[PDB]
Amino acid sequence: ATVAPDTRSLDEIYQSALKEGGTVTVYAGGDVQSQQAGFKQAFENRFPGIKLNVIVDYSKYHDARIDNQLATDTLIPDVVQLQTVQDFPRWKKQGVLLNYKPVGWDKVYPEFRDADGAWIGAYVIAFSNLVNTQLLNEKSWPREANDYLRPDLKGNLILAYPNDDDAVLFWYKQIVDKYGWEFVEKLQEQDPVYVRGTNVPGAQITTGKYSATFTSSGALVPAAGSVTRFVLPKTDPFVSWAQRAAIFKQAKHPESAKLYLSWLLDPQTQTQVSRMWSVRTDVAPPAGYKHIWEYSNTRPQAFADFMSDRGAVERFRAQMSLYVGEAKGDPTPGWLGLHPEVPLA
Ligand SMILES: [Mg+2]
């Protein structure tokens, strides 16, 4: 089906959405439900009477959950938004996605959108250095990969399990490409602490238990008095991608789903709610930064290309497992089962 970019205002979409019962359900990729709390609060304040029933789980479990619900005709969500970006062209070809070009679709950087409107990049996430600014002075913030091998960072590092999250894994793929397996070998001698949940390193660094990590997201504009800082490398690669979102063809609440996606793309949402880069060409990067596509030391399309070859990803993941061990501990989102209809208690 051929569609044109939505020309309606948010309020015009919103009045139309209100007829649907006052709830839109979103299966969103993430480590913990709290990561979506800001979006939920902003959305529900902006559109009174419509609840953003967003449900967080690892992307690698949400996509399987959607595949199984499709197979059994028990589909629950209106919208899916994940970092497993290779799923979206597959679901498109399967015919289960609603072609919709949201408000602002024309301004989305072309590689961050499906040409027919089958899916859209919602916002940009990047994984790189996160440092404790009270433990480390600015001149000593580690920024390059080999900075983490210096003696005064031994025992002071906490890291997300690369074998539990493919975006984390891709950071290592790039670094091994450049510096070889010797980097991973030397890194283990630093006695890093590995954890599940990409939220956890930043959480424990904030409390002062660790000094730094190199596979974390973070605010480009930190809040006043923040003890942490997201810091890019000067030269070394970092990971970035556009989180992908789509509406299902069988969505029970298509107008509300449309509202959500159009709201995500709004310039205010892109700069005031989303905490990193925007997918839009007409949205200024935060002061001090360039557009994500202007950094020579990251390539969002490289993550997508990586994720398309499951065999290559698996082989690299398995080798990393031999260096860091099996991913230990409980899954941070909790265990949602096959048919979560609301967030966990
Ligand atoms: Mg030792």
Residue numbers in the entry: 28 to 372
The paper states:
In this study we show that IbpS, a protein secreted by D. dadantii, can bind Fe3+ and Cu2+. We demonstrate that exogenously added IbpS reduces the toxicity of H2O2, probably by preventing the Fenton reaction. Our work establishes that members of the Ibp family exhibit the same fold as SBP proteins albeit with significant modifications making of IbpS structure a prototype for this family. The reduced pathogenicities of D. dadantii ibpS and Botrytis cinerea ibp mutants reveal the importance of this conserved protein in the infectious process deployed by necrotrophic microbes probably because of their impaired capacity to detoxify ROS produced during infection.
The crystal structure of the translocated region of D. dadantii IbpS (residues 28–372) was solved at a resolution of 1.7 Å using the single anomalous dispersion method. The asymmetric unit of the crystal contains four chains A, B, C, and D that are nearly identical (rmsd < 0.4 Å). The structure of the IbpS monomer displays a typical SBP fold with two α/β lobes connected by a central hinge region consisting of an extended two-strand β-sheet. The protein displays an additional α-helix at its N terminus and an extended C-terminal tail (residues 352–372) that, to our knowledge, are not observed in the other members of the class II/cluster D family. The C-terminal tail connects the two lobes on the edge of the substrate-binding pocket and appears to stabilize the protein in a conformation similar to a closed state, even in the absence of ligand. Furthermore, the central α-helix in the substrate-binding pocket, which is involved in iron or ligand binding in several class II/cluster D members such as AfuA39 or FutA40 is absent in D. dadantii IbpS structure and replaced by an extended loop. Moreover the ligand-binding pocket is partly occluded by the C-terminal tail and the N-terminal part of α2. We observed two dimers in the crystal formed by A and D’ (symmetry-related of chain D) and B and C’ (symmetry-related of chain C) that were original and not found in other SBP structures to our knowledge. The interface buries 1230 Å2 and is made of electrostatic interactions between α3 from chain A and α15 from chain D’ and vice versa and between the two α15 helices. Several residues involved in the dimerization, including R223 and R337 are strongly conserved, suggesting that dimerization might be a general feature of the Ibp protein family.
